[PDB]
Amino acid sequence: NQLQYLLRVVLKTLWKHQFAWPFQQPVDAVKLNLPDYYKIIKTPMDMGTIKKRLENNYYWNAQECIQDFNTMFTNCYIYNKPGDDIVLMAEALEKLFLQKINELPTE
Amino acid sequence: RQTNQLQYLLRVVLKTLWKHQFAWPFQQPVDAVKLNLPDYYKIIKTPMDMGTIKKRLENNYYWNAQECIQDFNTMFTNCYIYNKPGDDIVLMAEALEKLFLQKINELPT
Amino acid sequence: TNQLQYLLRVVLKTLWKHQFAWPFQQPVDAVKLNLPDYYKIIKTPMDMGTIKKRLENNYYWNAQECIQDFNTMFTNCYIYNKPGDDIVLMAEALEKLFLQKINELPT
Numbered sequence: 001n002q003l004q005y006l007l008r009v010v011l012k013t014l015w016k017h018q019f020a021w022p023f024q025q026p027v028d029a030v031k032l033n034l035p036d037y038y039k040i041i042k043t044p045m046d047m048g049t050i051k052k053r054l055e056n057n058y059y060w061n062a063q064e065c066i067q068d069f070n071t072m073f074t075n076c077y078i079y080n081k082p083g084d085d086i087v088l089m090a091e092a093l094e095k096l097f098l099q100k101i102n103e104l105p106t107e
Numbered sequence: 108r109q110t111n112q113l114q115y116l117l118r119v120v121l122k123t124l125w126k127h128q129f130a131w132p133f134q135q136p137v138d139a140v141k142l143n144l145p146d147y148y149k150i151i152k153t154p155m156d157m158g159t160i161k162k163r164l165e166n167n168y169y170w171n172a173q174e175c176i177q178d179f180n181t182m183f184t185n186c187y188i189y190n191k192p193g194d195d196i197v198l199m200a201e202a203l204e205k206l207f208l209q210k211i212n213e214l215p216t
Numbered sequence: 217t218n219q220l221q222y223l224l225r226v227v228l229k230t231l232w233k234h235q236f237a238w239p240f241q242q243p244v245d246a247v248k249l250n251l252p253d254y255y256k257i258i259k260t261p262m263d264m265g266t267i268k269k270r271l272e273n274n275y276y277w278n279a280q281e282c283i284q285d286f287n288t289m290f291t292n293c294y295i296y297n298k299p300g301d302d303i304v305l306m307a308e309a310l311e312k313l314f315l316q317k318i319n320e321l322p323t
């Protein structure tokens with residue numbers, strides 16, 4: 001199963017990286033005075049959510065979880081100015097994500 | 108073509124039922140203490156609620172779809188036993204039972 | 217039927233209800249018990265609590281990785297504590313039972 005790989009290798013790699021903490025839970029727009037955030041981002045997403053979806057049999061298959069990881073990154077690129085701290089962090093994780101996703105087994 | 112039944116019970120059936128206006132009585136167990144109904148757990152031997160059915164889908168409890176379906180049936184039939192026809196609680200259960208039966212008819216193969 | 221479902225619904229359920237389970241239903245709180253050495257001696261703590269959260273969220277690659285955890289829990293107990301101790305006899309009762317139930321494992 002590919003879902004096992006995503007939970008046991010991909011997610012675990014990403015979650016232990018030093019740059020993970022901003023994406024381990026939803027962006028708290030309230031704490032940060034961002035009333036624009038949830039208006040600009042209509043599908044918010046995080047490794048918080050992806051984790052619990054993997055642990056609670058939410059996905060139809062692996063490719064829906066992959067779509068969630070892409071959304072999480074692109075959300076970050078949509079809201080934030082290019083080349084900010086936070087954007088570079090997303091890119092480091094996205095590069096690491098694409099590497100890990102190539103070794104994905106088949107069935 | 109290749110769809111799992113339990114997935115569908117989760118992503119489609121439970122999800123539809125959960126959002127519906129009349130869903131809240133059934134989203135957690137019936138609280139005997141809060142209502143002072145010390146007879147509920149005597150009369151209703153196997154209690155059940157969408158909240159439990161949800162944890163069971165989320166945590167690999169059920170053996171097959173039949174078993175999840177039966178807990179649905181049980182929740183409704185429990186409610187119909189304990190409360191007497193005409194009550195709002197029963198009408199609400201009757202609405203969700205109908206809808207359940209539609210969504211069950213679309214189930215994978 | 218499936219081997220992971222068996223472990224969850226039969227093996228764990230039986231072991232969980234049993235009277236000697238309570239010390240193995242959560243980690244060994246080395247803080248509460250003033251046991252500085254426990255996490256130096258026992259390099260992989262394990263307990264039925266953690267196994268359950270593992271079976272319920274989708275941790276295990278296969279049934280054997282669940283079984284190695286059950287065996288770890290028992291041997292961790294046999295290592296840390298002295299033979300004869302109450303806690304050991306409890307684990308021995310649970311081992312006997314665990315093994316009985318594993319002989320009925322599905323094909």
Ligand SMILES: Cc1cc(F)cc(C)c1Oc1ccc(C(C)(C)O)cc1-c1cn(C)c(=O)cc1NCC(=O)N[C@H]1CC[C@H](O)CC1
Pocket residue numbers: 022023025026027028031032034075076079080085086
């Ligand atoms: C604000 C911030 C400062 C920093 F140094 C590093 C990060 C990651 C920062 O971003 C976050 C910090 C904490 C949190 C918490 C944990 C509260 O949910 C979220 C973010 C944050 C996360 N993600 C994924 C984002 O895409 C964007 C985030 N933060 C946007 C942000 O707060 N921008 C400020 C807003 C005010 C501006 O005048 C100055 C910049």
Ligand SMILES: Cc1cc(F)cc(C)c1Oc1ccc(C(C)(C)O)cc1-c1cn(C)c(=O)cc1NCC(=O)N[C@H]1CC[C@H](O)CC1
Pocket residue numbers: 131132133135136137138141142144185186189190195196
């Ligand atoms: C009591 C009640 C009043 C109401 F207007 C609407 C509902 C759904 C009501 O039922 C419940 C309200 C709250 C809760 C909580 C959330 C506390 O578990 C449960 C019920 C309830 C839910 N289900 C599924 C049931 O089968 C039965 C429930 N409750 C029945 C009940 O309380 N009956 C007595 C019987 C005599 C009446 O004159 C006074 C109320």
Ligand SMILES: Cc1cc(F)cc(C)c1Oc1ccc(C(C)(C)O)cc1-c1cn(C)c(=O)cc1NCC(=O)N[C@H]1CC[C@H](O)CC1
Pocket residue numbers: 238239240242243244245248249251292293296297302303
């Ligand atoms: C200490 C104890 C006394 C007792 F009468 C029965 C048991 C099972 C006992 O062991 C435990 C009691 C509680 C807990 C909690 C729940 C808090 O994590 C754990 C244990 C315990 C569990 N398991 C599985 C172990 O392997 C070891 C445990 N603990 C043993 C322990 O603390 N030993 C000390 C060692 C020093 C001695 O002077 C006093 C006894």
